[PDB]
Amino acid sequence: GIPAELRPGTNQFLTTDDDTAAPILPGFTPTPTIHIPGEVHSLLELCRVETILEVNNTTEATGLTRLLIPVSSQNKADELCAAFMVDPGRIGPWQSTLVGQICRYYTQWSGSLKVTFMFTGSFMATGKMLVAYSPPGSAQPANRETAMLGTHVIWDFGLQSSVSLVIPWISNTHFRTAKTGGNYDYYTAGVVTLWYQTNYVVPPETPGEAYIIAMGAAQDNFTLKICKDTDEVTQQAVLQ
Amino acid sequence: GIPAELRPGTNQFLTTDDDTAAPILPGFTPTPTIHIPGEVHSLLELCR
Amino acid sequence: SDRVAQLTVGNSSITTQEAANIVLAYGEWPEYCPDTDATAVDKPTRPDVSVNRFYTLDSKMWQENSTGWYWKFPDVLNKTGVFGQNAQFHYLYRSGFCLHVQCNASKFHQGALLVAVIPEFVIAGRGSNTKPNEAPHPGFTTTFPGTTGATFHDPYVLDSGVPLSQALIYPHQWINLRTNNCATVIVPYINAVPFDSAINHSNFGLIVIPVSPLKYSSGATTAIPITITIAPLNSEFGGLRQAVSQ
Amino acid sequence: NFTNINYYKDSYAASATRQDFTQDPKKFTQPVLDSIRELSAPLN
Amino acid sequence: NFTNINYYKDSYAASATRQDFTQDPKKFTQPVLDSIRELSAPLN
Amino acid sequence: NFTNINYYKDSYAASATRQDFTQDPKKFTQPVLDSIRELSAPLN
Amino acid sequence: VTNAESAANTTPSSHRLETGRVPALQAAETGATSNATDENMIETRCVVNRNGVLETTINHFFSRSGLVGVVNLTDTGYATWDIDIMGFVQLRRKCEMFTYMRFNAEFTFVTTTKNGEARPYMLQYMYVPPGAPKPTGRDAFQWQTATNPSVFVKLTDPPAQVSVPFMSPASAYQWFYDGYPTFGQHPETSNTTYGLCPNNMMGTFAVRVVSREASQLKLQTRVYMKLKHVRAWVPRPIRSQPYLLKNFPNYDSSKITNSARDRSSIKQAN
Amino acid sequence: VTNAESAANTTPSSHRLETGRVPALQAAETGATSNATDENMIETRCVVNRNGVLETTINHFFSRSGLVGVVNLTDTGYATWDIDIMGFVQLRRKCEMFTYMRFNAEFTFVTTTKNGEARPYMLQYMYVPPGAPKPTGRDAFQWQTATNPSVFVKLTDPPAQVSVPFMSPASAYQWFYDGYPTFGQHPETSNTTYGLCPNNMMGTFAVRVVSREASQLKLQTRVYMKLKHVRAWVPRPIRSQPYLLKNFPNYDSSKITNSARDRSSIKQAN
Amino acid sequence: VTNAESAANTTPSSHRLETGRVPALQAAETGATSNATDENMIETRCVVNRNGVLETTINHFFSRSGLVGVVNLTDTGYATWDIDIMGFVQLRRKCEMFTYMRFNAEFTFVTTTKNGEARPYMLQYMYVPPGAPKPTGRDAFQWQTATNPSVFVKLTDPPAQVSVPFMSPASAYQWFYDGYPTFGQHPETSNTTYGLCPNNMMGTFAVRVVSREASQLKLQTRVYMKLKHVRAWVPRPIRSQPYLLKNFPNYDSSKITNSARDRSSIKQAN
Ligand SMILES: CCCCCCCCCCCCC/C=C/[C@H](O)[C@H](N)CO
C-alpha cells in the first residue's frame, strides 16, 4: 500500500470530463472503415457556405415568399428596399441561415461576415443598388446620404447577377457574445441596408416586379468560443 | 489496483493550499494580452 | 469557353449553349470499388457501355403556382433500359450518377429553380399525432415515386421538417431564367456500405423547388416544361439471381 | 501532461487522442469542376 | 519537489508557476523625465 | 499498456499473459496417414 | 488540405483603379460559395490573429456527456430499455446534423430514488445484445451473465461508467435511411417500416435489484452518454420543426413554425 | 503449425476446362474433412480480409466470470460447500465441451441478505483442503486458521476476490472418468462410484459470521468463478440433453429432446 | 529592472565635511519620492540582510481562498447566484486596491444544512453563461446540461472544487469603469447605469437538489474563491469609508469616518 490522500473533486461526475472508462467488450475490433465522400473535421467548414436569409420574415408573407426581397419601379428617388441587423445570434433573418444556427451553439463569435445578393428577374431589366453596412451608433439611417457614409457597394444588375458585401470586423473587444438585448447592446454589429440607388428600369411587355435572394456566410477569420445549448429545442414530455 | 493508505489531512479544505483543480472549460484559450502601463509585481513597490 | 459544353457518355450526348458550371459533389469523382473497401467475394459485372448513358425522363410542366418535385436516384431507373434489368437480376449495386436538369425560357420570362441532391432524403409523414401506432406514414408511391416523380406538399420544410433556406449545404445549382437554363451535378457513390441493393434502398434524391415563381406578360409561351436526364456513371453489379421487380 | 496513457489492451477505452487540425473547405465552398479565379468574372 | 506537474491539456488548471522576482520601483518612485542625482539639489 | 505487471512472487496471480496465435487445424481436419492432394481423386 | 490553428490573418491593401479586375461580382448560379475576401473590397490593415479555433472541431463539439434515456424501475422486479439515443431532443439534434457517424461511446449510470436519495442497496446492470434472451423475472437464469457484460454497483457509490466500442455491422451509424429493411409488397396506407435502419439496433439494456424478496422502492436510473473518437460525414441542415415521434422525422402539417421571428416591416432593422 | 491473425484471404481464380483435375469429388469414408476451397469451385475475386479472430481462442472464451455455487447461511452457525463447479448448467457445458483442462482460477464472493441488503457485519471465509478437519460449530477451534487460508470481509465491502492455482495431483482436470476409484467386487445393481475421478475433489469451503452470540440474519453468498491461463485437450461434442444429476451425466430415457426443431416437410426450407 | 530576493543590505559610511553635496534636501514639488538612504545621513555599519521578501508578491498576496458569495436554497426548488465577487468586504478591498486584474480562479463549494449537518443527498451545480437560458423549475429541461458544465456532488462528500480560466472579452478585469455602457440621453436624476462595466458580467450560477419529489431541507452553500496566475495594473488607494452598495462605490455624506483616530493634542505622541 502506497500512501495517498483524497482531494476535493472526489466521486463527482463532471459532464465535460476527458477520462478513461472500463471497456465492456475485451479484445474487440470494429468493422473496417470505407471511403465515404464528404468528411467534416470542424464546424468552421459549415459556416463558410452561403445560405438564404429570411429578410422578408414580416407578417403577411405566407410560406416561401419570406426569402425574397421584392424589387419594382419607384416614383421618388433615393428610395429604400430592405434593412436587417447583422447580429447572427439574434432573432431575425440570420435565424434562418446556417451560420446563425451554429453560432447559436456557441456563446461567442468573431471575424468578418459576408452577404451575397442574387437577382432573380428578367434579362431585360437593368438597375443599380447601394447596399451599405453601418457600424453601431445611432439607429437605422433615414436618408441615403447618411447610409452612403459607411461602407457601401454599388451593384448593378448585368450579366453577373450576384454581388457580395463583405462585413468587416469592426469591434472594440476581441469577441462578441451571441446574445443581444438589454445590457448586451454593447455587442451589436450594425445595420445592413439596401437602397434603390437609381431605379428599376424595365422595357415594355416585361413584368415590373422582381426579387432578390439574400444569402449569408462566414469568412476566413471567423471563429467561435465557449459552447452552449441552443434556445430552439423545446420538449414537454419524452418522445415515446 | 496499487496499495495506498490514507493519512490525516484527508478530505480537508485548507484555505491557503496550493493544489490543482478540474477545469470546467476544456480546450480554452483566453483573450490575448495587451500592454497596459503600470504593472505591479510586489507590494514592496507601493510602500516606497 | 465556359458556357458552351458537351457531355458525351456512352452513345448519348448533351449539348448546351449557356450553362454556368458543373458542380462536382463533395469534390470527388465516381470511382470503382477498390479491393480494400470491398467485402463481397463474387466477381462483379461491368457493362460499361449499356448502363453508363443518359436516360431521359418525362417532362414536368412548370405552372406559376408550382411547389416542386422529387425523385429517388437508383429507383427512377428500374424498368427502363438495360440498367433496370441489371438492377433487377442482380442483388448488389454501386454506381455514381451525372445529373442534368434543363429548363429553357425566353428573355421575357423570370424565375428561378433550386436543384439539389439530398443523400438519404427520407420523406416524413405529415400530421400531428405523437402516438407510435396511430401516427401517419407515407405510402409506397410517395417514398419511392418511380419515373413519374412526386410533388411537394410543403416545399418550405422539404416535406421532412428541414428548412429549405439552409438546404444549400448540398451539392446544388440554380436555374436562373436570365443567366442559364441547365444545372448539372456529378455525384459519387455515397453510402455507409460498399455495395447496396438498388430496389430497397434509395441512396439520394433530386429536389427542384421553384423559388421566385414563373412570371411573364400576355402573349408569351405559357407551357414551360422541365426535363431531367440521368447518367449512371461507373455502374457495377453483384449477386446474380432470379429477377425481382420490387 | 500524461493523459494518453491507457491501462487495457483495448484501444477504444483511452482519452481523446491527438488533435489534428485537418481542414479542407474547398470541397463544400468551391466544388465546381473548372477552377474559377477570384479576381475575374465567373462566366466569361 | 514535484508540484508543477499537471494532468490535463488546459494549462490554467496547474499550480502556482515559477516565482520570478521582478521588481521595477523606478516607475512609481522616480517618474520624472530629467534624471535627478541623490547627492545634489533637485532644482539647481 | 502496463497490465502484465505482477505484485507477488506467485506467477499464477497475474493477468492474461501473451496472446499467441497458435493454430494447427491439420490434426482435426486431415488426420489420415497418406497425404491426399486437393486437386485429385482421394481413392485412386 | 491545409492544417493550421489561430485564424487566417489579413494583409495590407490599397485602392484599385483599373478595369477588368472585379472581385465583387460573383455568380451564385454555379452552386459555389463566393470567394471575395476583406482585402480586395476595402482598404485594410495588417493584423496577426491569435483567436484559436481548437474548440470548433467535431471532436470537441461531441465529447460532452448528455442524457440519452431514463429507466423507471418500480420493483415486475426488473426494467428494460432498448438502446436508441434519439429520445431526447438535446443530443438528437446535434447527431442529426450529420448523416453518417462513427464513434465510440461512454455511458454513465445515475440512479436515484422516488423522493431522491441513495439507499445502500445493490443494482445489476446487464447488456443484452441482439439475439440474447431477455430476462423474464427478477430471479431468472438470464441474470447469471456467464457471457453478457454486467455491472454490480450500489446506490451509495459514484455513478457507474463503462466504455463501449463501435458495435455496428456496417461501417458507420446512419440516422437517415431512405429505404425499407425487407422485400415484398409494401402498403400504401401504413408504412410502419419505412426509414428503419437495421444497422442501428444494438440490443436491450436491463436492470434489476440483486435480492431474493421484493425491495419496496421505486428507483429511476438516468443514462448519460458521451461520444468520443467521433468521425462524421455528409453534413445536412439542422431541424427547425418540433419533434413528434422517436424513430421518425414526423412534423405537424398545420401550425408550421417559421424559422425566423416576425417584425413590423421589411425596411425596419429593429 | 501456422500462426496468424485476421482470416485467410481469397485469391483470383478463372474457369478450368480440363480432365483429371477434380477438386469437388471428396471421399468422406476416410474420416478426413474435405479440403475444397472457394477459388477452385467458382470464379472468385481478390479480397484482403481484416476480420480479427482474436476473440475465438480458448483463453478469451473461458476468461469470463460465472456463477459456480450458492451457499445459504441461516445462522447451525456456519455453512459449508464442497467445491465442485458442475452444479450450474451455464459454466458446466462450456467446461464439458472438453475432456482435459488445466487452468488457474479466480473466485469472487458476493454475499447478500434475505430481502437483499448489506448490514455492516463481519464474515470469515475459510478453505478446508482434503484431510483438514471441518468445523463443527460457530465458535470451534478450527476457525483459528493457523494454516488454512481465510478471508475476513464485511457485507458493506466490495466483493472479495482471491486467486487459486492448479491444485490437482494429476497433470490436468478431467471431467469424464471411464473407471472406478478402487478395486474389488463391483455390483451390477447400484454402481454409486462409477465415473468418479478422485483428482477433482478439492476440499470444502466454509463460512461463518465472526461473533460470540447468534446474529439474527439469513445470508446468501454466491461464488463467481473465472478461469484463466487455461489449456484444453481432446475436444468432445457438446451436450444436447437436459441435465438431471450433478456428478453424473444421467439423462431421461423417455421424452428424448431432438437436437433440431420440427418442420412440415423435407422439401420446404422455411 | 532588478531581480533579487532578501533585502538591499547597507554599506559602511563615514562622516562628510564638505559643501555642495547635500543628500538630505529633497523637493516634493516634483512628484518624485525622495531617494535619500541610510548611509548618507548617519554613520552606519555593514550588514548582510537575509529577510526574504518572497511573501510580498502580488501572487502570494492573492493566492488565498476567501468567501465570495452565499446561496440560500429553500427547496422554488432551485436557487441562482449572479457571479460577482464584490459582495463581501474582505476580498473586495484587496481586489479594489488595483484597477485592472487578469487572473485565473478556483471556486470551492461548501454546502451545509439549517442547523448544520450533511445529509446524504445529491446536489447539482450548473454554470449558466451569459445568453444561456436560466432554469425555471427543479425538473426543467435546462438541467440536462448537454453543453453547460455541471458538478454532481453529495453533502457527505468533500467540498467540490473546479478551476476557472480568464473568461472576459476584454484583456483584463477592471473594477472601476468611468463611463456608461450605451449611447443616448443620460438622465440627471437617476443614473442607474453609470460605472457598470459589461466586461465583468460572467453569468449565473444555479443549484438544485437532484430528485423528483420535494426534499424537506433548507440548505446553504458557500462559494469560496481563490485567485491564481494573477497580474495587476495601475494601483490605487485602498478604501477607508464603509461600503454601502454592491456594484457602486457609494459612501455616506454625513458621519464621514476619519482615516486616523483622535488624540489629545498635536504635541503628545501617545
Ligand atoms: C451494462 C454496461 C454496458 C452497457 C452497454 C450499453 C451500450 C451498448 C449499445 C451501444 C450504443 C451505441 C451508440 C448508439 C447506437 C445507435 O446509434 C442507436 N441505436 C441510435 O438509434
Ligand SMILES: CCCCCCCCCCCCC/C=C/[C@H](O)[C@H](N)CO
Ligand atoms: C477462502 C478463500 C479461498 C477459497 C479457495 C477455494 C478454491 C479451492 C478449490 C480449487 C478449485 C479448482 C477448480 C475446480 C476443481 C475441480 O474441477 C472441481 N472439483 C470440479 O468438480
Ligand SMILES: CCCCCCCCCCCCC/C=C/[C@H](O)[C@H](N)CO
Ligand atoms: C458549476 C461549476 C463551475 C462554476 C463556474 C463559475 C465560474 C464562472 C465565473 C467566472 C468568475 C471570474 C471571476 C470574477 C469575474 C468578475 O470579476 C466578477 N463579475 C466581478 O464582478
